[PDB]
Amino acid sequence: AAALGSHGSCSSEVEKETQEKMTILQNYFEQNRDEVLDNLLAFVCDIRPEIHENYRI
Amino acid sequence: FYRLKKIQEKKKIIKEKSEKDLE
Amino acid sequence: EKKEKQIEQQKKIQMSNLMNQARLKVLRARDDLITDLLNEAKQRLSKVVKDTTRYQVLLDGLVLQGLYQLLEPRMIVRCRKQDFPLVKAAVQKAIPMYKIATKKDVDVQIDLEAYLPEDIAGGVEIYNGDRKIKVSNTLESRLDLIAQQMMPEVRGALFGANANRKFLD
Amino acid sequence: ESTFGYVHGVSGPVVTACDMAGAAMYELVRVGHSELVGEIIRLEGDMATIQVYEETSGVSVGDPVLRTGKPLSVELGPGIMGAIFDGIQRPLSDISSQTQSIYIPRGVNVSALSRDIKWEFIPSKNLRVGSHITGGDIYGIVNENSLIKHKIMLPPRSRGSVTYIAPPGNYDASDVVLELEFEGVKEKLSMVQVWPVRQVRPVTEKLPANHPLLTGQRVLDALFPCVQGGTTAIPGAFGCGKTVISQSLSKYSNSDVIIYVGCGERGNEMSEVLRDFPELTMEVDGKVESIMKRTALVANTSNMPVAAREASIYTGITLSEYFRDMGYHVSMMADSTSRWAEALREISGRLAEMPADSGYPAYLGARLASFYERAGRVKCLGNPEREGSVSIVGAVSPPGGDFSDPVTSATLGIVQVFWGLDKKLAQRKHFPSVNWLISYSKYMRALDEYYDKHFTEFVPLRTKAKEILQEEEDLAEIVQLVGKASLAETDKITLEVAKLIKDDFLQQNGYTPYDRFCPFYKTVGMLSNMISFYDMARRAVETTAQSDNKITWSIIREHMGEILYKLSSMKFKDPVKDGEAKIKADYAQLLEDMQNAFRSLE
Amino acid sequence: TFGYVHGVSGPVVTACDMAGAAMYELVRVGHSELVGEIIRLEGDMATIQVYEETSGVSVGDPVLRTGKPLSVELGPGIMGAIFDGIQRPLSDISSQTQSIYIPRGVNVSALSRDIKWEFIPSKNLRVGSHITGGDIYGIVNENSLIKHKIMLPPRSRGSVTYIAPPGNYDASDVVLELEFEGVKEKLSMVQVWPVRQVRPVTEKLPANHPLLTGQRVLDALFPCVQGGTTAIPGAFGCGKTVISQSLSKYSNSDVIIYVGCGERGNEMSEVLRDFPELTMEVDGKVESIMKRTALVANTSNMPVAAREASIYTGITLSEYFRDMGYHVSMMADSTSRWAEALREISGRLAEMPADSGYPAYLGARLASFYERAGRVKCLGNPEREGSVSIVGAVSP
Amino acid sequence: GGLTSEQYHSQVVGKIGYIARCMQTIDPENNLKKIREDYQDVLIWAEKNYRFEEILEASKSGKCPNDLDALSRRSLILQELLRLVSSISPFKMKLDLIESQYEKMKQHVNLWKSDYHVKLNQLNQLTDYLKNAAPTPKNN
Amino acid sequence: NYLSQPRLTYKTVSGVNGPLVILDHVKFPRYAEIVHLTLPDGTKRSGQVLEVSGSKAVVQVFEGTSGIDAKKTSCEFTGDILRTPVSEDMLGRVFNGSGKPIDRGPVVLAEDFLDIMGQPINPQCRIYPEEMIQTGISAIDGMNSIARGQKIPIFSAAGLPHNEIAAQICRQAGLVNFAIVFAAMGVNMETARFFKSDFEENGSMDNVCLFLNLANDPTIERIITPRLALTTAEFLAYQCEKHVLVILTDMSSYAEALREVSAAREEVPGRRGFPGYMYTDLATIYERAGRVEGRNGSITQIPILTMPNDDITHPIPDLTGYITEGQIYVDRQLHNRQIYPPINVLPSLSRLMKSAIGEGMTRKDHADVSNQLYACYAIGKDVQAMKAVVGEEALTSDDLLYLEFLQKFEKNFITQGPYENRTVYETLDIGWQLLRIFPKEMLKRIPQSTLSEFYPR
Numbered sequence A: 001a002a003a004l005g006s007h008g009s010c011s012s013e014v015e016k017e018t019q020e021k022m023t024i025l026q027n028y029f030e031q032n033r034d035e036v037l038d039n040l041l042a043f044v045c046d047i048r049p050e051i052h053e054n055y056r057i
Numbered sequence B: 001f002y003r004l005k006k007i008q009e010k011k012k013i014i015k016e017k018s019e020k021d022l023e
Numbered sequence C: 001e002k003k004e005k006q007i008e009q010q011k012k013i014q015m016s017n018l019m020n021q022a023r024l025k026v027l028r029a030r031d032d033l034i035t036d037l038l039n040e041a042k043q044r045l046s047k048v049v050k051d052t053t054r055y056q057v058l059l060d061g062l063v064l065q066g067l068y069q070l071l072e073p074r075m076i077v078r079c080r081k082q083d084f085p086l087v088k089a090a091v092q093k094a095i096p097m098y099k100i101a102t103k104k105d106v107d108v109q110i111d112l113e114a115y116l117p118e119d120i121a122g123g124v125e126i127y128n129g130d131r132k133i134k135v136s137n138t139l140e141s142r143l144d145l146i147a148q149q150m151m152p153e154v155r156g157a158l159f160g161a162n163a164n165r166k167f168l169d
Numbered sequence D: 001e002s003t004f005g006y007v008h009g010v011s012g013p014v015v016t017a018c019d020m021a022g023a024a025m026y027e028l029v030r031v032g033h034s035e036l037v038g039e040i041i042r043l044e045g046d047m048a049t050i051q052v053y054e055e056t057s058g059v060s061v062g063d064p065v066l067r068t069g070k071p072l073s074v075e076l077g078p079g080i081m082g083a084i085f086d087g088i089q090r091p092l093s094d095i096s097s098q099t100q101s102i103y104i105p106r107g108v109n110v111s112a113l114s115r116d117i118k119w120e121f122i123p124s125k126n127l128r129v130g131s132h133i134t135g136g137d138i139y140g141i142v143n144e145n146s147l148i149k150h151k152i153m154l155p156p157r158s159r160g161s162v163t164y165i166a167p168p169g170n171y172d173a174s175d176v177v178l179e180l181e182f183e184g185v186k187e188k189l190s191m192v193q194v195w196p197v198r199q200v201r202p203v204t205e206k207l208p209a210n211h212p213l214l215t216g217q218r219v220l221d222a223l224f225p226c227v228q229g230g231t232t233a234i235p236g237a238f239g240c241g242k243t244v245i246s247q248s249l250s251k252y253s254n255s256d257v258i259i260y261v262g263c264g265e266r267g268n269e270m271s272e273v274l275r276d277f278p279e280l281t282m283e284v285d286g287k288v289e290s291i292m293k294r295t296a297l298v299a300n301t302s303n304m305p306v307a308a309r310e311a312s313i314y315t316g317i318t319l320s321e322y323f324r325d326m327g328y329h330v331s332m333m334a335d336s337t338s339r340w341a342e343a344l345r346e347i348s349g350r351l352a353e354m355p356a357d358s359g360y361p362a363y364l365g366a367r368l369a370s371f372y373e374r375a376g377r378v379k380c381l382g383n384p385e386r387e388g389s390v391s392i393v394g395a396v397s398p399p400g401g402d403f404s405d406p407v408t409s410a411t412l413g414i415v416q417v418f419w420g421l422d423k424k425l426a427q428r429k430h431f432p433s434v435n436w437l438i439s440y441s442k443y444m445r446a447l448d449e450y451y452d453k454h455f456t457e458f459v460p461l462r463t464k465a466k467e468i469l470q471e472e473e474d475l476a477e478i479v480q481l482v483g484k485a486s487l488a489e490t491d492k493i494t495l496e497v498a499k500l501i502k503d504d505f506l507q508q509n510g511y512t513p514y515d516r517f518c519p520f521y522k523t524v525g526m527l528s529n530m531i532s533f534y535d536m537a538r539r540a541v542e543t544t545a546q547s548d549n550k551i552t553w554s555i556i557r558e559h560m561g562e563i564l565y566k567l568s569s570m571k572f573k574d575p576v577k578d579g580e581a582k583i584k585a586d587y588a589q590l591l592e593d594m595q596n597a598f599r600s601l602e
Numbered sequence E: 001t002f003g004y005v006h007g008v009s010g011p012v013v014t015a016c017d018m019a020g021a022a023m024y025e026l027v028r029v030g031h032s033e034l035v036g037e038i039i040r041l042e043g044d045m046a047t048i049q050v051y052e053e054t055s056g057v058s059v060g061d062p063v064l065r066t067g068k069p070l071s072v073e074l075g076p077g078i079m080g081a082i083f084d085g086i087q088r089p090l091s092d093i094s095s096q097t098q099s100i101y102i103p104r105g106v107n108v109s110a111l112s113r114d115i116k117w118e119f120i121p122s123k124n125l126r127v128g129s130h131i132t133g134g135d136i137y138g139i140v141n142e143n144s145l146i147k148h149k150i151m152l153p154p155r156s157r158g159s160v161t162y163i164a165p166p167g168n169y170d171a172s173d174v175v176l177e178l179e180f181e182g183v184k185e186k187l188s189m190v191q192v193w194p195v196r197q198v199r200p201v202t203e204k205l206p207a208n209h210p211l212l213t214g215q216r217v218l219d220a221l222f223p224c225v226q227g228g229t230t231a232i233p234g235a236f237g238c239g240k241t242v243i244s245q246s247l248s249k250y251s252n253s254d255v256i257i258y259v260g261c262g263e264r265g266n267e268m269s270e271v272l273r274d275f276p277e278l279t280m281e282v283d284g285k286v287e288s289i290m291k292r293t294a295l296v297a298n299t300s301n302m303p304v305a306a307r308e309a310s311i312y313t314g315i316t317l318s319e320y321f322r323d324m325g326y327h328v329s330m331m332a333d334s335t336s337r338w339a340e341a342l343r344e345i346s347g348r349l350a351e352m353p354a355d356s357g358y359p360a361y362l363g364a365r366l367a368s369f370y371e372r373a374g375r376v377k378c379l380g381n382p383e384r385e386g387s388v389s390i391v392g393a394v395s396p
Numbered sequence F: 001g002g003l004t005s006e007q008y009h010s011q012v013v014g015k016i017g018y019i020a021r022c023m024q025t026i027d028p029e030n031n032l033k034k035i036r037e038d039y040q041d042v043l044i045w046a047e048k049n050y051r052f053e054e055i056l057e058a059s060k061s062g063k064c065p066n067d068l069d070a071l072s073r074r075s076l077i078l079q080e081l082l083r084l085v086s087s088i089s090p091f092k093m094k095l096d097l098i099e100s101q102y103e104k105m106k107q108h109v110n111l112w113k114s115d116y117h118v119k120l121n122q123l124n125q126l127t128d129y130l131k132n133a134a135p136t137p138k139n140n
Numbered sequence G: 001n002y003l004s005q006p007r008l009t010y011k012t013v014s015g016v017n018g019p020l021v022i023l024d025h026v027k028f029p030r031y032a033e034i035v036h037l038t039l040p041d042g043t044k045r046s047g048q049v050l051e052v053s054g055s056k057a058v059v060q061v062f063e064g065t066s067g068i069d070a071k072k073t074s075c076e077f078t079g080d081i082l083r084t085p086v087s088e089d090m091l092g093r094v095f096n097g098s099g100k101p102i103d104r105g106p107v108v109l110a111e112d113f114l115d116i117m118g119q120p121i122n123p124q125c126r127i128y129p130e131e132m133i134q135t136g137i138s139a140i141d142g143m144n145s146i147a148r149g150q151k152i153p154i155f156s157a158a159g160l161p162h163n164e165i166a167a168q169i170c171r172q173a174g175l176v177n178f179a180i181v182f183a184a185m186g187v188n189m190e191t192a193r194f195f196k197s198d199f200e201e202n203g204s205m206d207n208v209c210l211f212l213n214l215a216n217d218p219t220i221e222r223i224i225t226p227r228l229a230l231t232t233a234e235f236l237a238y239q240c241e242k243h244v245l246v247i248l249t250d251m252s253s254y255a256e257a258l259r260e261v262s263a264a265r266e267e268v269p270g271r272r273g274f275p276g277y278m279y280t281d282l283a284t285i286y287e288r289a290g291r292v293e294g295r296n297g298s299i300t301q302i303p304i305l306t307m308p309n310d311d312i313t314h315p316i317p318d319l320t321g322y323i324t325e326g327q328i329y330v331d332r333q334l335h336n337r338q339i340y341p342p343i344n345v346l347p348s349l350s351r352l353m354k355s356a357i358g359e360g361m362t363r364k365d366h367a368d369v370s371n372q373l374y375a376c377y378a379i380g381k382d383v384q385a386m387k388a389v390v391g392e393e394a395l396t397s398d399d400l401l402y403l404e405f406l407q408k409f410e411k412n413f414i415t416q417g418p419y420e421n422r423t424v425y426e427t428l429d430i431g432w433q434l435l436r437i438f439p440k441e442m443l444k445r446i447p448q449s450t451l452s453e454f455y456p457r
């Protein structure tokens, strides 16, 4: 019974810590999303057509 | 076995080269 | 006492499983956030394709990029019906730029019997005349190809840099 | 003609290249946009096949293959000593210093000998404009290290009339220090020469080898001696001491310089050498100095590219032939000549050649022969006379621990010394694990003329030691099926002295300071005592078994048990703490103590 | 549809117009339809190792590719059947031909059609219901001992569009239809599965419950778990029949599979004579063990590929019954005869010998076979555990 | 080893649809309220007429419940209740007993190890035999 | 920067033979690049270009060639070699032999895309492994001590408890940051569950990564499995500066995958049909160990291998024995007598031990005590072999003492509980409690100073 009570307490603690970590992840995302999204969009749009370096003639 | 297998492969390659030379 | 050791071991295993599932919930949340960033980039591309000005510049790039990968003397370009007027112009600009850079003639056709799916936001796919070899320049493929390789920069921005990483070995 | 061809195909370390019309066999090439070194192993039309000396992962068809007209070659000159090089002569120290990374980057083009360093050059004074000069002439001495006067000399292919000679001063590896003219053509020489590694550096004559290469180890120096200029193998299973011996010769020998070739060896070997050799010291002229100042390392650790093993062997012998031409008594370690033979196996396999045994190519015997025959004592090339040598020590590593192995079999037919290491001794931690039954040296007749001078007592002792050990084996084959009670008392004495010789003479701990080195005067003094016990104990039985007053091995052991313990204790005498006179006096006291004890039994 | 024979040399047949072929796909070669497996492709041509004797195959003969690698027809009609190692029904070959021989190039379907079995559809299903691989869409009451749980193939999934009412059906009547991605699958009761592919499961469980044999030394001192892997030294004097028959007459197992990996002709026929006559008590009745076993019997002169495939067929049958939630047991009467067959395949493929002449992959072929033992949570929804216990005899 | 992603999510939408078919069979009337509440999260995805593809992509998106170790436990409890109620078909058990047996099974560590499952398998062994067995003293 | 150019995809499978798919018409084949194959049924597979020639590219397929089709197969050439998406977040996770996750977590978000082959650590920058690890096992910490960053395999007969010893090293290993990378090649699920369960039960997961290739997983992944593990260990030990312990399970099954590939490619055989290059290939795995200049981190390795037919001379233990620094041996001649852990010291040796012992690391007697334990144990086996012929009547009183030494040595020095941890100092105390069986003068490997300080204590 003492082990079962400790497991229930630990379950609450790890869930609380998980929701805290998920909040921190959401914050770093929302602080940076625009720059990242714009950088991927810049690289994906900036095609730069290239022939393979080993091509000859 | 390995020597004889490589000999048989080299003979197959010679046959393939001869078949190309007959073109 | 052997049963009590099994109770303590079960408690340890259960607390270990809790910590494992907690860690995985965080990692799943990271992957979902990176997935949401890539989906928002796919949505931004699905807005860019409405501007025929920027989208013609993309197709002029994507078509010539395809030609420069295949290098064959005959090629087939595949697009949606909505793209085709832009893609025809892109091919007509690309053939000159191709013959200049490669010093050789090419025949290029658009695949009017086999358009791309309407689910595609935009871009082109290019094939040999014999169809045995292809290059994929759909906007979805371009975004996945780059966004996979840029993932270290993406993680470093959306979660901060790793304080333990001290050398680029 | 185009200076480069193109990669046609790749298979591990072997690259086929098209547009190679007019490329020489064993010409060196740069392959790929990263310019990986490789050497032309075959020619097949307007097309070549290249043994690439660096890892080909990522090489592409149509990659440029630059030709050079150079064969595989080593820069020779100041700044070799104390440096560590890869298998293709690039200094691992400058690779680290330039790259600022723990890894060796693919295709690094770092110059082998540094050009920013200025070296102190003393011209040979006798030379002047108009003087005649030929290959191997020492035209100046560079003060490279406190130990090593780097004798700069004309390249062996060069000759002519001196047109300029630099005055005493400081110069780099690109500064012209000598200029010749021959047939009206000028030739400018810096302190660095390039030699094709596959071509033997010539000599005036290959002299007979007639002086011992004294080593760290008792069994080597005494019972199976190497000679300065001798060819030696150390065939042994894993974990036997083949590198401990290779290190112990390098740490403790009368060789003027060591070239240590880590060909295919484990990585921490080079780290252990670089850890120990700057801290360990010889003495010269009353000055203590680090042995790293007389050693060069050619690393090519087991993970570094398979082809570079061949280039590493040929690099280390080319460095060794260079210091041989300076008159230095060079010693060259090769940490596994079978890990070299395995690289010949692999390239031969990629080329799909027919194998001889265990997949090894048919030319393996000639490849090993034209390596060991680079050893010798020589009258060097050129004007001032020198008597330099290369002594080669190939740590053969037979697959499965079995000396029937083709590398071992071919090596044994080529070397003159064989220190066969037995895994059963190494398991027992009996080190050095040299098996005294199978081992041999062909140099004994040439070395007897040295022992008769410097150690006139020794040749009888060497002979008696081998005989006592042989008798112990010929006795053991009986005892193993009947028990020790079958033996005569002379044969108990033979077995017991063979145990003294096994456990206290032949055995030697290369780490503990008392046995870390063992000079020949310690070695002969130890052996003289153990054989003095044998001759006296044998005489004691043979003198008295004719009578009721018979002496026995048990009588000797009970009267002389302290002498047996003292005989075994002789290894603990330490040449760092104990002077030569002290060790000699103690060993003379044991001779007298034994004589008076045996005189007390008779 | 079919290519044409281009060349022949012993068992190896080269065929052309094979452009659509696949590596290890199974082919019917010649007008006699000899079985053969594609061992190589070289463009529009394939090299087929014909299993059966190729004598009389002609250039320009048809070469019909079956769309499938070597595969077992799973379904009702397995229980009490005897097959060779490539899954041909030896009792039906005899009864349909009235010959003592196996004819070269038998076409006979491995679960006999035109037999009708009582099928009950799983009463909860409806048109529009969701279904997943390994779901039980009905039961076939073939025997009093064994009720065959008809189930969706492991790769199949979708929405049910039709289900057959309670009634009598042969193995090729359509029993279920379902749609996924706008494509319909029509399902027979027969299910075809590649013999060298492990049948997937929801979880490979730890094995924990004993396979009681009813033998004191075995059940006490050396217990084998259900789902356990075990070996017996199969040799003349040893009495290997005692464990075999004891497992048959008493074991805590629901279905038993035997594999003859190329037994001696008489020794194989001794086994095939005995098992119809063995019986066990069930619900106070006594019944023949052939109601709960299948025999994958090969003599030493069966095609090499039948001997090498013999274990893979036996384990694919055993995994199929495992996925019904039956605690299967199986024996191989000598894995050494299977390894001789594997050695001969390797010698005909001209591959390098490893130890004692055996191929390099012998260790991984054995280990990947024994790894197919275990206890499992099956696929599909009815939350059923099953197992396969493997008793592979060895002949050192 | 394990399952391909298509197989894994297919097994999830399987167990969701099956829990719903079981729920409709154990309780055609919404009488087992406390039981039905413990499946409301999965039941919505089958009480709504979703296409198999829609529920599958919802499982990939994590909107459907999608841990198979959770769904197997949750489904096993319901099926062992349904096997109980079906194996006693001639006598409809009381609703409080049904929700009590459900709670006891929900509290147990592993039902296949439980004596509950042993007793229930013996009930099925008798019942399934008696559905087929001919007239004789033993069978009467 | 990123490879911006779009990947070509080829249907031009001009042949299939064994595990090889031979593409043709390929534009500038890159040697050892990775290709993603799509089979006719849409099944994804992966493969490495093992040879190139003009337009041809010989792709070895990891998942095998069964079902590859010369018309409907599509081969996407990625334009680059095989890379691992490494990160710190690989600790606490489980992956299959190809680096895909199997813990039902997401794919790894890469902090870097390290080349799976790594690079040769420059021998000038390789720090010599001087620091000791206590494994907690007396048969190791006494006579076979392991240095921080020292590669040293467990060699075992088949069926021996070598997995339980390697688990005990993971359980008890500590110095006299830390992490583990576990790899397994061709492990049965009954053993894979044991390692995964032991790490989860000991709560170690937050500092261990597992790569599992199970016995039924495609055999070619065994070749990349220990390389994925080591690539992750190089990230953790050099980019993050952890002390990493790498456990590689059944390098025998790795070497069997080499033998399979060579037999299928018809590469030149060495002994027992293994590739002639097997020493180089094993060196590409085993040399990725040890400390490096300016990094606090280190990669220790404990490879594990079942010696085939107990043959110490077999190519697997032989080539492993020529690369790795020292070998720990476990023996049926101990295990049948219930002596756990079954570590036979006599064939064992730790090459880096000579440096990892004495003052500052361990007691000053340790180097001498170890060598005398070897002498007494060995002479014990030698007089035992004599006794089996001539009987105990022919043995001397000292020979009976070497037999009593052997009995007391195996009972006290080797035998140790699976959760019993012994310090090196406690092990040396037990060492002297055995060496004290002989009179002082018999101890011919030990210096008189060491005897005078420690023999009477």
Ligand SMILES: Nc1ncnc2c1ncn2[C@@H]1O[C@H](COP(=O)(O)OP(=O)(O)O)[C@@H](O)[C@H]1O
Pocket: D236, D237, D238, D239, D240, D241, D242, D243, D244, D245, D431, D432, D433, D508, D509, D510, D511, G322, G349, G350, G351, G352, G354
């Ligand atoms: N002369 C010696 N004195 C002491 N220990 C030795 C001696 N020779 C070998 N050893 C021991 O044997 C080990 C294996 O020898 P080593 O030469 O390193 O192996 P290999 O023969 O594989 O190169 C060494 O690490 C050392 O512990």
